[PDB]
């Protein structure tokens with residue numbers, strides 16, 4: 001649900017967007033519904049897994 | 058679960074970006090708008106490439 | 115997150131207790147009262163030294179809105195409580211509403227709380243409860259603090275001076 | 285033998301933790317520091333003992 005509140009201003013915004021995610025298994029289905037405040041997916045992506053890889057800075 | 062996502066993506070060797078709901082044809086009664094001022098591109102107000110901020114139409 | 119707080123305080127070598135909202139001048143339309151019977155001091159009913167259990171004054175609990183700007187070089191630990199009455203009648207009694215909520219926001223987080231009124235087994239003579247919550251506010255950060263009832267406001271929040279080798283033992 | 289004994293590190297690269305996950309961060313750190321001190325100890329001790337044994 002939305003949590004409307006005044007925030008300290010960050011990057012000129014007093015509001016916020018939370019980001020959420022899931023990994024959908026092959027053959028699985030996502031039923032996606034909203035009554036507002038939805039930022040819908042685009043360029044969701046298929047994952048090809050492997051190993052030895054990771055994230056470094 | 059950002060930290061968890063960083064971990065899930067650590068083992069991804071590749072991926073396929075898909076249009077899931079990419080066009081006005083996926084969203085005939087919703088549009089993409091809302092605050093774009095803080096996610097600008099080369100000085101122009103804009104939105105995230107992989108997400109559709111939907112508002113009513 | 116008590117266990118997490120015990121860990122955060124394990125590296126604190128010192129701190130400065132601040133009055134954040136200490137007086138009737140910080141709270142002209144709210145007062146400090148409510149159940150004090152179980153937090154007595156030398157036999158007298160009382161309240162926590164670093165927290166202000168606010169109730170309405172003259173029948174009202176105005177939407178509360180306060181903020182603190184951390185204009186210090188140190189991180190500030192802010193503690194709050196949320197009251198969870200044993201009965202709906204005890205919320206009304208403090209002029210808190212049925213739709214009371216607490217909303218705490220800083221540039222890096224937001225959390226919203228609502229009361230969960232329920233009869234509890236009686237503990238230390240109370241059928242209700244108070245949950246305690248906290249955050250560490252970074253230098254230059256601001257907390258916007260709001261409530262529609264059930265708020266136990268901070269007092270003697272404190273600046274943390276960090277170090278190492280320290281911790282908590284029993 | 286010394287070369288064969290080490291397990292190529294096809295392991296976690298590193299992990300990030302949240303503000304309220306300090307105990308988890310510290311557990312992970314303890315695990316990394318623990319394993320690091322154990323392996324530094326074992327690596328240096330193996331080399332010192334093997335060097336003394338080799339020269340002997």
Ligand SMILES: *[C@@H]1O[C@H](CO)[C@@H](O)[C@H](O)[C@H]1NC(C)=O
Nearest residue numbers: 081082083084085086087114
């Ligand atoms: C758009 O709205 C019309 C009118 O309510 C409806 O008939 C149509 O099916 C909607 N489009 C989609 C993709 O649901």
Ligand SMILES: *[C@@H]1O[C@H](CO)[C@@H](O)[C@H](O)[C@H]1NC(C)=O
Nearest residue numbers: 011094095096097098099103
């Ligand atoms: C990208 O980073 C630069 C850093 O100088 C910042 O000024 C700009 O606002 C950022 N833009 C977006 C869309 O995040």
Ligand SMILES: *[C@@H]1O[C@H](CO)[C@@H](O)[C@H](O)[C@H]1NC(C)=O
Nearest residue numbers: 139140141142143144176179
């Ligand atoms: C107390 O209430 C009065 C009347 O609504 C208001 O004018 C005043 O600003 C309030 N005090 C504070 C600190 O907000």
Ligand SMILES: *[C@@H]1O[C@H](CO)[C@@H](O)[C@H](O)[C@H]1NC(C)=O
Nearest residue numbers: 151152153154155156160238
């Ligand atoms: C303090 O501890 C004593 C232990 O005998 C207990 O009887 C008393 O009620 C406690 N008081 C408070 C305020 O916690």
